Amino acid sequence: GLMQFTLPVRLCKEIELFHFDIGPFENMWPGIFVYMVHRSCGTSCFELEKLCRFIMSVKKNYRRVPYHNWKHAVTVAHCMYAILQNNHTLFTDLERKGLLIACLCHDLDHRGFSNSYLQKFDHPLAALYSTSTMEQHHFSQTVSILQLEGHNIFSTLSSSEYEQVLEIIRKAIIATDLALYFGNRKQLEEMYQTGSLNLNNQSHRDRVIGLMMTACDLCSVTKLWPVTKLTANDIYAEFWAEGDEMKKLGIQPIPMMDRDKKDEVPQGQLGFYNAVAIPCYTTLTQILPPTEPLLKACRDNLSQWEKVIRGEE
Numbered sequence: 001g002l003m004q005f006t007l008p009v010r011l012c013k014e015i016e017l018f019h020f021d022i023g024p025f026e027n028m029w030p031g032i033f034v035y036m037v038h039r040s041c042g043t044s045c046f047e048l049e050k051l052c053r054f055i056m057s058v059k060k061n062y063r064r065v066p067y068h069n070w071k072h073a074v075t076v077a078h079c080m081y082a083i084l085q086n087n088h089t090l091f092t093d094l095e096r097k098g099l100l101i102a103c104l105c106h107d108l109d110h111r112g113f114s115n116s117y118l119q120k121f122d123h124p125l126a127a128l129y130s131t132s133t134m135e136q137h138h139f140s141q142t143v144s145i146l147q148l149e150g151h152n153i154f155s156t157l158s159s160s161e162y163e164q165v166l167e168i169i170r171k172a173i174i175a176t177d178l179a180l181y182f183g184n185r186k187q188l189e190e191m192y193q194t195g196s197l198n199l200n201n202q203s204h205r206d207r208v209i210g211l212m213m214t215a216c217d218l219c220s221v222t223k224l225w226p227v228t229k230l231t232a233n234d235i236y237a238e239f240w241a242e243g244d245e246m247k248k249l250g251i252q253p254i255p256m257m258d259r260d261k262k263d264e265v266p267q268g269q270l271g272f273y274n275a276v277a278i279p280c281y282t283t284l285t286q287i288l289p290p291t292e293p294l295l296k297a298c299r300d301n302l303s304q305w306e307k308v309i310r311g312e313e
């Protein structure tokens with residue numbers, strides 16, 4: 001009960017900032033996450049024994065892929081932690097419980113391959129889940145782990161509160177499908193500008209949560225430039241491996257996944273920042289003003305990629 005997690009001074013201070021990097025010490029990441037649950041949610045939110053056993057089952061069910069790994073899950077949970085802590089009163093007890101867990105579980109059992117590659121390979125998961133293939137699997141894996149003996153961290157919730165939290169986590173995880181992000185932000189942009197956005201409307205809350213999930217999922221772009229640049233190597237390591245597997249299926253991959261076209265990465269990043277990242281944090285900043293530091297960091301990194309192209313680095 002009176003057992004709090006306490007980080008070293010530098011981590012205790014920097015964990016509260018949006019651009020925090022969780023560091024290369026794998027064995028500290030569970031403690032970092034439990035710390036965030038306790039400050040964001042409360043010490044009474046979860047049974048410490050159940051939570052610790054849930055976290056270690058989640059970790060085990062992430063694979064040794066360059067990017068879609070345990071570090072990403074914890075990194076995405078931290079961005080959500082920083083959003084929730086800067087937006088104290090805007091979110092319910094069930095939401096702050098569910099969203100940190102959703103982020104931690106959002107890429108469970110990822111193979112480093114896209115929905116597109118699973119489809120063209122004709123992978124069994126593509127038969128089971130025709131759209132948002134991996135994201136339906138990520139939620140399936142989340143339910144499975146929650147049903148392991150001694151793993152149900154929501155056991156003290158009522159039948160109706162339990163159904164509500166799993167519904168938040170399902171929508172939250174499905175929203176990390178970037179194919180769905182474009183339509184969701186366009187609808188949020190329309191609602192904000194015409195002034196019809198209403199945070200008491202449950203269908204509106206779902207869309208805002210969904211945009212928060214995209215913002216946390218893409219948060220690599222909101223880090224200090226060295227972290228952003230080095231993370232980009234891991235991201236393209238997965239894409240190029242997928243490009244290799246496309247060629248093996250007798251399909252030329254898109255330039256993004258073709259390692260022969262490494263030279264075009266800097267321009268590919270500008271397109272992504274202008275098409276996806278900058279619009280995402282702009283709409284999020286409009287709806288939740290205290291998330292402005294993500295937009296600012298994202299813009300700082302867009303300028304850094306423009307310098308790369310101009311041969312200044």
Ligand SMILES: Cc1nc2ccccc2nc1CCc1nc(-c2ccccc2)cn1C
Nearest residue numbers: 218220221235255256261264265268269272
């Ligand atoms: C998807 C994606 N998601 C990210 C999430 C977080 C951080 C960085 C990310 N970068 C990308 C890749 C962006 C991208 N690269 C190219 C391209 C690269 C070389 C040659 C040709 C094209 C095209 N597009 C769209």
Ligand SMILES: [Mg+2]
Nearest residue numbers: 106107134176
């Ligand atoms: Mg994913």
Ligand SMILES: [Zn+2]
Nearest residue numbers: 106107176217
């Ligand atoms: Zn992810």
